[PDB]
Design a protein around this ligand. Sequence first.
Ligand SMILES: [N-]=[N+]=NC[C@H](O)c1ccc([N+](=O)[O-])cc1
Ligand SMILES: [N-]=[N+]=NC[C@H](O)c1ccc([N+](=O)[O-])cc1
Ligand SMILES: [N-]=[N+]=NC[C@H](O)c1ccc([N+](=O)[O-])cc1
Ligand SMILES: [N-]=[N+]=NC[C@H](O)c1ccc([N+](=O)[O-])cc1
Lengths: 252, 252, 252, 252
Amino acid sequence: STAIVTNVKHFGGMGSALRLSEAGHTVACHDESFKQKDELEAFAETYPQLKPMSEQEPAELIEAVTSAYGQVDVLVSNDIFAPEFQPIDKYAVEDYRGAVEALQIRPFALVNAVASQMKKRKSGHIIFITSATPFGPWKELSTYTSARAGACTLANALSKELGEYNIPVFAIGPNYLHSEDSPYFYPTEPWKTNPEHVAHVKKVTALQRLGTQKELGELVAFLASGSCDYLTGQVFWLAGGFPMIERWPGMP
Amino acid sequence: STAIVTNVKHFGGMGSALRLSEAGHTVACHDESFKQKDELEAFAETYPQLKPMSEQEPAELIEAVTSAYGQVDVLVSNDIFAPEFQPIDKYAVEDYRGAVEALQIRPFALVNAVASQMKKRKSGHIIFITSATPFGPWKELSTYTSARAGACTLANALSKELGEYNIPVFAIGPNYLHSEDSPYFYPTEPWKTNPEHVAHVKKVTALQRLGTQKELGELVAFLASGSCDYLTGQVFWLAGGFPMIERWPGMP
Amino acid sequence: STAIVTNVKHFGGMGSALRLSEAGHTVACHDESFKQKDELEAFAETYPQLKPMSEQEPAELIEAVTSAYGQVDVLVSNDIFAPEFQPIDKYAVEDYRGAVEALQIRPFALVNAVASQMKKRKSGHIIFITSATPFGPWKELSTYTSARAGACTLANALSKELGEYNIPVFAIGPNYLHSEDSPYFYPTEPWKTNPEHVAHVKKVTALQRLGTQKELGELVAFLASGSCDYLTGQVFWLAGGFPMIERWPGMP
Amino acid sequence: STAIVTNVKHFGGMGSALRLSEAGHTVACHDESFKQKDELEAFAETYPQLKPMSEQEPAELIEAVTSAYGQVDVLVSNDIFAPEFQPIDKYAVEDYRGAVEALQIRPFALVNAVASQMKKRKSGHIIFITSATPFGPWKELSTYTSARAGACTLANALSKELGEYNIPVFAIGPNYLHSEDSPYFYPTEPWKTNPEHVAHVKKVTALQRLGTQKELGELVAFLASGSCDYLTGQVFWLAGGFPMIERWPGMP
Ligand SMILES: [N-]=[N+]=NC[C@H](O)c1ccc([N+](=O)[O-])cc1
Ligand SMILES: [N-]=[N+]=NC[C@H](O)c1ccc([N+](=O)[O-])cc1
Ligand SMILES: [N-]=[N+]=NC[C@H](O)c1ccc([N+](=O)[O-])cc1
Ligand SMILES: [N-]=[N+]=NC[C@H](O)c1ccc([N+](=O)[O-])cc1
């Protein structure tokens, strides 16, 4: 079928697009950099099994993919934001508005733009790549964490109405997911190269390692395949057993 | 001490302000109508124990209450929004922005404005009145429901950073909470007077009745009293046992 | 690899064994009926790809499969119980003991018996088929629902310690999952044949249909394939969007 | 009214019993040690405001309290168990049976014995003192943790059926709750006196301190007063913001 993966160069983007592509789907890919022809052309040459698009806005993008390939069967809203850790009083309200715009308004805008066509033919799959931080919040990241929570619930809520139209909706919330060259959350440097970071991951996750782009891709492809639509409304915690809670003194 | 209750005329506003005042607290009250001298004076006459403020914006309000009464010890962010039920594709993206602005950005801005004074003296209580809807989403209310979830997580996340400063943070999520004359969610008319509505409440809640402002007020006053700070981070489900789940055919 | 699926004739048993066998695994199956020679042989003739075992107890079952096929790589504890709907005071305390023994003690015993061999070679997958009822309890099913909750948490807790040994642990909680000829919860008759039952399912689930054994098996096979171990600790709500909550009067 | 607090010398026992008595309630207390006249009379002399009972079994206790003090209006099931920490394969299945018997079967049996009388009057309150561990499992404590989860769900489930009879049901899940002289979970020695332990608590809790019996007592009395029945079904996380999650390397 035809799928859309946003911010393809970051977070869960490459893992999702590459695996969906290998499953035989036509993967239209969005990314802020594709605004420039040079950047879109470079990506296209590197990944001929992918279809990079230049469109940036929700409605614009859904329409271009629909016109180019016929329709949008799968939506993978891989949302990202660059937050700063900050005490609640040191943030600017604008800082929270920005987090909400990127992690809640954006996914909502994409579904708002594609829902009608999916509902008319009674088929489609919606997947939000959110975060697991709501399940185990760190101190001083209130804007990002709360925003991601809104996104998770958005997915769960949407599943309730779209189910009638045979449209499953899921939210995959990762943490400690290797992002390779992307700074979006866990790049190879320093997460696989620095001793302190390696030891941190080994302590905080049950599997004692970062999650792989492949694991994420497999999950995305599995859900988009229509192999298990009954999981609609599910919020997945792709966090490898995180969080590992500090035990009493004397316990290793 | 000194407390602030926003949108006092609606939702959990009156129950909160009334019980807090009966507790002996100085209660400064905010409300959109207080922009009108007439409305402010009339309120002050009916509830002489309460101190209505004309200030509307977060920073403005915290400053006004601080100058007038010395400091803000308790913040009750009683947030409201009037959403429409709509299939995802029928909403305007602006409809989600409005919901998020009123239910997430506002409480965030109020804490952002008062946190520094609380942290300096290492004392204060923060209470968000959110919603139990995220716990049991209805079909077609994705904007309001997801926004409320962000607010619940905001509170929990904040409890993590403010705990070091001895500042408890709670979120009270009601549903089917009687609002008396306020149209915000459950006014006396028609919820206590129309058969179909009375019957609906009886079916969906375990206690088979609306919750009372008195009950909400007792909880707010209890948490603000400093009698049980150890519940910091709690999301309270003030919904009378909702949701009651439809059982199999033939079962009573 | 070698998998074990318990109570194979009921609940999530057939979907799990069938799809696991299709994935190329050797599937040893347990069932109370296999105690009888006639039953075991009739099953082996009908499903020649499956390996019915006569063993009934945890330790002997794990030992027999290990001796016959070498080792137990995957454990699918498909637990069942036949509860009665009763007001708390009409139950016998023994009724709860029986529910806990069947839904909590059994899976714990199976893991207790196989854990050491999986830990030694640092490989294996543990999957509990539990229930979604804890997520949305009905009245008068306190014994079954609470017990199932104990099982979900058991899986999650186990993921924390077994992760260090590369052993993912999952809990699949279904509801409204078609069980075909098995009375364990949703047999074809009357769930797909009687108007009121069909209409009931269309009302309380988002997808407005029963889940299929195929969907359950696909999930079980996906998880056992080692394609997404990073989901360890996950409790899956295989309930098609259930529960759908009754909305305000006037809303369809 | 008349309240029953079990295992009064341990866990949330004294805090609950003492505050309930200060509130004016007649508080019948149960404890395994009260089987000895010596221990019972000694307790009675020290706390003339409490009424220790010798009865050990549920049915016997409810009848004894009903006969001596008219009826049972409030049940505080303060359940305890002394678990060992161990990898799943090192436990004895009997170890899990003991945990479930003490933490799940016991509270169930007590409600099973007093429910009929409360339903008849259509009044009463049920409070289970469980645990917050299910919310943040430590590895190697799978028996205790999962059993506690079962008890939490048992409460929420019962609220669904008992609400129709105006009987609120709650579950208070503590962690890091100071237990003073009782070894049940957090005694003064060493939690308030040994550096390594004091520091551990400082690290894992948001408020950076142990919870006080007074706090637990206030919550119990508040809920038992009928001041806020609309919270029925609630699972309270009385853990001071626990768990605090370890942050990235370099972060303070
Ligand atoms: N996979 N993964 N990681 C995503 C996670 O939501 C996240 C964790 C930390 C931060 N951060 O900024 O510290 C951002 C996102
Ligand atoms: N108590 N109470 N009500 C608050 C709840 O969040 C809510 C429920 C329904 C609606 N609504 O618009 O139908 C709005 C808010
Ligand atoms: N699939 N599926 N359903 C299993 C579910 O746990 C269940 C639902 C109802 C009952 N029951 O007895 O009514 C038992 C189990
Ligand atoms: N308050 N409090 N503690 C109760 C909690 O469930 C618990 C935590 C740890 C242990 N333990 O044995 O380590 C037992 C119980």
